[PDB]
Amino acid sequence: VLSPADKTNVKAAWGKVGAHAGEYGAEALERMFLSFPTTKTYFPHFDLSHGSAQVKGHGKKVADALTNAVAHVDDMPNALSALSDLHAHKLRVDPVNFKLLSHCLLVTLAAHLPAEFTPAVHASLDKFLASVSTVLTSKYR
């Protein structure tokens, strides 16, 4: 469970993200594809080259989803409810990849926020991203 400091911690870290959403989210996806190629099996229909339009627009979607989650950190299962549906019924992504992406998100926030990524904020973000993965994978079976 996300402690009080967890929510505050994530709110301040994610805030600093600001309007660099589709940018950070697209970097995280790209970091994930290159570092864990197996995650590419799920985007066969995508143009996965550097800076493609599909990743960009898709990175913006993941980044916004996380921003909504942060604003609803108290009730994530309700806000991500619709998304949990998609990933569980259609996309059918293996739960292992959720960790791979969270890690790539951590690395992007780390590489863009030299000041905001403290050990505590780092610990709180990891927890937060693991809670979002938990929800996105709740309805699998």
Partner 1 sequence: VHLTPEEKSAVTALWGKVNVDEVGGEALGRLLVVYPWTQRFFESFGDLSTPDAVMGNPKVKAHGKKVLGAFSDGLAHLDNLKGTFATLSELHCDKLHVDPENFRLLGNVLVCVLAHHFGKEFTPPVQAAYQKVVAGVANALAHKYH
Q: Which residue has the tokens 């980044």?
A: 63
d(CA 44, CA 92): 14
Interactions with partner 1, residue window 107-126 (CB under 8 A):
107-108, 110-112, 114, 117-120, 122-123, 126
8 vs 68, beta carbon nearer its own copies: 8
Q: DSSP string of 79-93?
A: HTHHHHHIIIIIS--
Identify which range of 11-19, 40-48, 53-61, 69-77 contacts partner 1 by CB under 8 A: 40-48
**Residues touching ligand HEM: how many (CB under 6 A)?**
21
Entry field: residues in the chain: 141
Interactions with ligand HEM, residue window 60-79 (CB under 6 A):
61-62, 65-66
Q: What are phi and psi of 70, to 5 degrees?
A: -65, -40
49 vs 81, beta carbon nearer its own copies: 81
